Design a binder for this molecule. Sequence first.
Ligand SMILES: CN(C)[C@@H]1C(O)=C(C(N)=O)C(=O)[C@@]2(O)C(O)=C3C(=O)c4c(O)cccc4[C@@](C)(O)[C@H]3C[C@@H]12
Ligand SMILES: CN(C)[C@@H]1C(O)=C(C(N)=O)C(=O)[C@@]2(O)C(O)=C3C(=O)c4c(O)cccc4[C@@](C)(O)[C@H]3C[C@@H]12
Ligand SMILES: [Cl-]
Ligand SMILES: [Cl-]
Ligand SMILES: [Cl-]
Ligand SMILES: [Cl-]
Ligand SMILES: [Cl-]
Ligand SMILES: [Cl-]
Ligand SMILES: [Cl-]
Ligand SMILES: [Cl-]
Ligand SMILES: [Mg+2]
Ligand SMILES: [Mg+2]
Lengths: 195, 195
Amino acid sequence: SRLNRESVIDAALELLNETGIDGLTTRKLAQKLGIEQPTLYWHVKNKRALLDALAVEILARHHDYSLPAAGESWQSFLRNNAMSFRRALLRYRDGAKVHLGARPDEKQYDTVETQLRFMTENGFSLRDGLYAISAVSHFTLGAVLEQQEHTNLPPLLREALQIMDSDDGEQAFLHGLESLIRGFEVQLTALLQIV
Amino acid sequence: SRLNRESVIDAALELLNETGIDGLTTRKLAQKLGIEQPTLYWHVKNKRALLDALAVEILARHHDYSLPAAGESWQSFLRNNAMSFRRALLRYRDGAKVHLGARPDEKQYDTVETQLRFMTENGFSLRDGLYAISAVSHFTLGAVLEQQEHTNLPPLLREALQIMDSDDGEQAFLHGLESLIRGFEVQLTALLQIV
Ligand SMILES: CN(C)[C@@H]1C(O)=C(C(N)=O)C(=O)[C@@]2(O)C(O)=C3C(=O)c4c(O)cccc4[C@@](C)(O)[C@H]3C[C@@H]12
Ligand SMILES: CN(C)[C@@H]1C(O)=C(C(N)=O)C(=O)[C@@]2(O)C(O)=C3C(=O)c4c(O)cccc4[C@@](C)(O)[C@H]3C[C@@H]12
Ligand SMILES: [Cl-]
Ligand SMILES: [Cl-]
Ligand SMILES: [Cl-]
Ligand SMILES: [Cl-]
Ligand SMILES: [Cl-]
Ligand SMILES: [Cl-]
Ligand SMILES: [Cl-]
Ligand SMILES: [Cl-]
Ligand SMILES: [Mg+2]
Ligand SMILES: [Mg+2]
């Protein structure tokens, strides 16, 4: 079949949904594509390189809210961005694991950059903007990982574990997300006051 | 050598630090212990079972702040608990990954339970206590995973990536942790007011 980048990634994503991250191999990708392994090697040098590309592509394809709208607030931006990031990570099997093992690609540099400039333009120091953005990313990645890796009791925990498996985790995610955002705002507004 | 539970786990933890999670195998554990594989199988049935036990043991050994002190506030408890949980997850290679893939063990049921009762005894509904505790756990797991898996630029990002690799991640972690805790308190205090 065709072995241009876009096609190889299409097939590897399809493969990822079939096998998950641990079970994805270049050998099975060759098989899926109808080719021999040394043919694949010309195109894709190893699993690490494949996963690096999948991490970038998964965001490029599906992470629709990386940039703020004209005039949007920083609260609203972080909210929408977190929800988009969560959604994209959920779309493929082990997507958060794929995301974690990879590097902040040159092809996205300018996206991140803009997000950091945006925070700063709304009153955060670089440091605080970064921390805000990192806390959101880590909270979101954590919540998704636990959702995806989720694949006799005491009473509270019995009702916790029922409550906990009542939807996708969307409720607990969204509730935490507001908590975090309000905590950032309380910090931003305080300036040099003891808070 | 000796193949009682405690010894097998000692050796598997030592092995985990040598190989990481992907590279830990029952075969290499047998090797480390000076035994044949079928001897190991009597004791440990597969990797999944090994990892399940390591996840529990890593907390039991090293997670010193699972229960609140007499009279401690819920803010203080969550803070200390998060820091303890982070510390324990960091102690072994891929510790957060080991933690994620495992299940909330019967041997800890009563620890979690108590934490959930404690939140509730301080004014949270079960739901909110749970969410608070889950957001902390997910934020912490996310931050640790990214620390552990962390193993030409634009300016801000250049200074972000320098700032970001200035310590262990302890600063960004602790700053987010306070944000989250304050966000929980703002929610708890508001009751039925629009907030
Ligand atoms: C908050 N939200 C989840 C952000 C986002 O939506 C991204 C995007 N491409 O649209 C990320 O890459 C984003 O999701 C993301 O993963 C970001 C990063 O990983 C990093 C790392 O590791 C180091 C320095 C800077 C960044 C970053 C500023 O680009 C991060 C931006 C993250
Ligand atoms: C907040 N802090 C990190 C808590 C903790 O310190 C624990 C401990 N053993 O001391 C956990 O097990 C704790 O770290 C932890 O992982 C908890 C859990 O995973 C769960 C899951 O998955 C489902 C229901 C309930 C729990 C829980 C209440 O036991 C969680 C308690 C977590
Ligand atoms: Cl071709
Ligand atoms: Cl292409
Ligand atoms: Cl491979
Ligand atoms: Cl807005
Ligand atoms: Cl023995
Ligand atoms: Cl023993
Ligand atoms: Cl194995
Ligand atoms: Cl206190
Ligand atoms: Mg990232
Ligand atoms: Mg857990």
